[PDB]
From a paper:
The transporter is made up of two distinct domains, a dimerization domain and an ion-transporting (core) domain. Here, we report cryo-EM structures of E. coli NhaA and [name] [name] in complex with cardiolipin and phosphatidylinositol-3,5-bisphosphate PI(3,5)P2 lipids binding at their respective dimer interfaces.
Overall, we collected ~4300 movies and the final 3D-reconstruction contained data of ~244,300 particles, from which an EM map could be reconstructed to 3.3 Å according to the gold-standard Fourier shell correlation (FSC) 0.143 criterion. For model building we therefore generated a composite map, by combining the maps before and after masked refinement, with an overall resolution estimate of 3.6 Å, although the final model resolution is worse at 4.0 Å resolution. We were able to refine the overall position of the short linker and β-hairpin strand predicted from the AlphaFold228 model. The β-hairpins were predicted by AlphaFold228 to be domain-swapped, and this structure refines well into the map density. As such, the improved [name]* structure is consistent with its previously proposed requirement for binding negatively-charged PIP2 lipids at the interface.
Residue numbers in the entry:
A (entry chain B), B (entry chain A): 17 to 496, 518 to 546
Write the structure that this text describes.
């Protein structure tokens, strides 16, 4: 053995060093760096010192066998050797036999992770923690604004990024860097959808530490929570798009079915999450598990995991379903659990979220582990930077003005610049980029996204405090109907009229 | 996808049903059944209803390719199809091509788990929880007795079981059930070492619920904690034994080196655990992490995991190292953490232990999932039952009398019968049996161990209360030097003289 133990120990040591450095920085109050940035820089240092440590070594090349009557590559295969049948499993495709002697040199440790690990065990805890951690104060008078942002602006930014990337691809074809025809507008739309999820975790941490006005913090948190799921589902829908004939056509009568599939997946995920939440709320309400905190906590965790697994198995997107289940749980079941169970669940979920985000950023800081990197064509990177900048610019101001037209007597002026400055890219974009491999445009997009994240997270973590001071943003503020489209008040009345007396308000807490 | 999600959802549903049934049983105070027994019976029911659900189906047979120039089976292989190289990984060997048409029928869902999962992610949490959960009261005046039991009695029971199994194998050869020569005394020793770990989890739960005299409870808990690691290391040492010539010989000059390897592995694991514990204790003592419960809790968890990983990568046994690290942590670092961090760590570890044991017992009840079962030869099962009974009989009474000779003025009389009745076999034996496969004696031993566990856990859970009432064991008792071999007092004085003032007694808690 002694294969995964070494890499896991290295990851643990890097996490310990990151925690120690964060404690040292916070002791001197230097700031200018977050735990995510520390983890990423430590991962970069580890990769740099591992790449150039034992590069001169032997060359290992795998043997080639001429397997006759083999026109397909099944996932599972049975090979009969010495009158004994052995099972072989297909894992990954490596089509770099030409550079195989170079790959053998400086092999060191691959330290690679399966792309589904980030989607099955790392992201869902973070999504559930984000959904459950609702202040339950405010976030409702501006809920419509958050929804309008996270819906319209994400699509607008995706379209703008796709158009600008298509234009830059045309310019490159004019320059003739490589072959013309490989890139397509579908790839541009995929890249735009991928570069639409924002997770300003450092910005949110700074806002919480400095006690900024809760309105801007709630708006940013809601946007970051919703746009991640919106971008994930949009990326899945774009990946579904496949015309029957004339590939990469325009208006091939498949837009309507793609939109229908998107709406159906979103509605199914929301319905499944709500159904699981109401089922567990009713189960807790009828039972008297308030005297057994361990049993009710375990039941809650198992029910949440079962909801996630049911969402994944049904063919829908598990992230959005988990988010909706978590927010509905925090809305309803939080008033029925015992006092100790609430604290236990909150501590467990926040610890899991912290560990998951630390591991995610530590692995993201590892940039030298991938041999199939395509970091070149600086014009492409510059075009991507301009596209994301202009997409962020057009996301806020037009929607902000449109909301200010029918504004609810609360003008959010001068806060748009802070939203412009908060343009971090979270783990969703990295996971989506790393999901697809062995493709030149995919590798180029992954490298560009990684470089953009490395630049933007560091620069915005460095400049958040000067930006806050320059805009005269109020800090240190203690947290302690008709205007709402006439629909939010009706929903609140309906909830307090029928749902509340049956789902809660009775039973020992 | 939709492969692991279905089985995980089935596991979650089984766990929920087990929890509901346990709550129903506890509401009526019927008892006579534990959560482990409920999980096992639910798994058995699920296996029974899954085996006979869709048995009539098609026959699937894997294709066979004549791969020339292939005299070995590498773990990783590279196959060139259509001028593209694909990586194939060797997973498992299935040498049942003759019964392959039968295997294809009623395939259903394999729901199998990797044998190293039980050793890398399931057992270590349970071991760490058991080591950390020390009462810190008593357990020291009888520590020598616990050590003498867990060391001498385990070896005596292993020897007795091996001798009796060898005798029964000779009797079978006389009866001529199968070929003579396949079995060996080494296999008997392996079986004896495997059938030496006792985990009376139901008995411990009953004792804790009924508030029995703490002396017997502490003795049983210490024996169950120590003998698991003792048996694991003994089994590893037995597996190491391999004579150079004349295989399965007696006194081949390898007993001395095997004992030396056993002692070295145990000493190295203990030293590594103690080193990690003192390192984290000093790190907590010097730092002021009492104001950051999240940071110190995460650091503690990461340090424990890193200690486990270092033990695994060092070539030693990780279970014993984890146990020693946990007990040393509970001894030293528990007095340095903040008041909230202690509760957070305890709740997290107890929840992890509960989930791990529930999953272990749910999977253990699945007996019909393994197609390569060898449940026959009832004489072998009867011999194993007699061997384990006589091993339990000879483990307690001789050692009890020897301790009563130089007894520390506290005669533990009439408690030996209860220790005889508590003869449960825990997850260690099942994991050791399932580690090795594709071998007729190994399969027979695994089947016999599974049947013995299924019988003994259920019968002892049913009969613990009548046994407790018959022996007039005191219940309901509230918990609130020279006699100790003259060495325990010296150790206590040394700890309180030098180690305590530096490791603890200073710093904000």
């Amino acid at each position: 053995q002694h294969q995964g133990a070494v890499e896991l120990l290295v990851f643990n040591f890097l996490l310990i060093l990151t925690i120690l450095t964060i404690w040292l920085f916070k002791n001197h109050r230097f700031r200018f760096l977050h735990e995510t940035g520390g983890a990423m820089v430590y991962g970069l240092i580890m990769g740099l010192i591992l790449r150039y440590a034992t590069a001169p070594t032997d060359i290992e090349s795998g043997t080639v066998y001429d397997c006759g009557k083999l026109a397909f590559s099944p996932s599972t295969l049975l090979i009969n050797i010495t009158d004994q049948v052995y099972e072989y499993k297909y894992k990954r495709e490596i089509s770099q036999h030409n550079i195989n002697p170079h790959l053998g040199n400086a092999i060191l440790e691959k330290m690679t992770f399966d792309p589904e690990i980030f989607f099955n065990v790392l992201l869902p805890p973070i999504i559930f923690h984000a959904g459950y951690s609702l202040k339950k104060r405010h976030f409702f008078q501006n809920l419509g604004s958050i929804l309008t942002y996270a819906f319209l602006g994400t699509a607008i930014s995706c379209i703008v990024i796709g158009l600008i990337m298509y234009g830059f691809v045309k310019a490159m074809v004019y320059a003739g860097q490589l072959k013309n025809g490989d890139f397509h507008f579908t790839d541009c739309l995929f890249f735009g959808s991928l570069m639409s999820a924002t997770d300003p975790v450092t910005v949110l941490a700074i806002f919480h530490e400095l006690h900024v006005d809760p309105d801007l913090y709630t708006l940013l948190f809601g946007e970051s929570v919703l746009n991640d799921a919106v971008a994930i589902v949009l990326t899945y829908s774009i990946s579904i798009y496949s015309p029957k004939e004339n590939p990469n056509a325009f208006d091939a009568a498949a837009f309507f079915q793609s939109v229908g599939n998107f709406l159906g997946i979103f509605a199914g995920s929301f319905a499944m999450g709500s159904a699981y939440a109401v089922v567990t709320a009713l189960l807790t309400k009828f039972t008297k598990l308030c005297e057994f905190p361990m049993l009710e906590t375990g039941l809650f965790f198992l029910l949440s995991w079962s909801a996630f697994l049911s969402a994944e198995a049904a063919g829908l997107t598990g992230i959005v379903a988990v988010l909706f289940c978590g927010v509905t749980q925090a809305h309803y079941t939080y008033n029925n659990l015992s006092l100790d169970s609430k604290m236990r669940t909150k501590q467990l979920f926040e610890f899991m979220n912290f560990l998951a985000e630390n591991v995610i950023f530590c692995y993201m800081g590892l940039a030298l582990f991938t041999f199939q990197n395509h970091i070149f064509n600086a014009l492409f990177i510059l075009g991507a930077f301009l596209a994301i900048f202009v997409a962020r610019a057009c996301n806020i101001y037009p929607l902000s003005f449109l909301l200010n037209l029918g504004r609810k007597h609360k003008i959010p002026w001068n806060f748009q610049h802070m939203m412009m400055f908060s343009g971090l890219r979270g783990a969703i974009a990295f996971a989506l980029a790393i999901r697809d491999t062995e493709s030149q445009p995919k590798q180029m997009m992954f490298s560009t996204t990684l470089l953009l994240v490395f630049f933007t997270v560091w620069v915005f973590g460095g400049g958040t405090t000067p930006m806050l001071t320059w805009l005269q943003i109020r800090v240190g503020v203690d947290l302690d109907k008709t205007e709402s489209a006439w629909l939010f008040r009706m929903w609140y009345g309906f909830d307090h009229k029928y749902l509340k007396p049956i789902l809660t308000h009775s039973g020992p807490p």
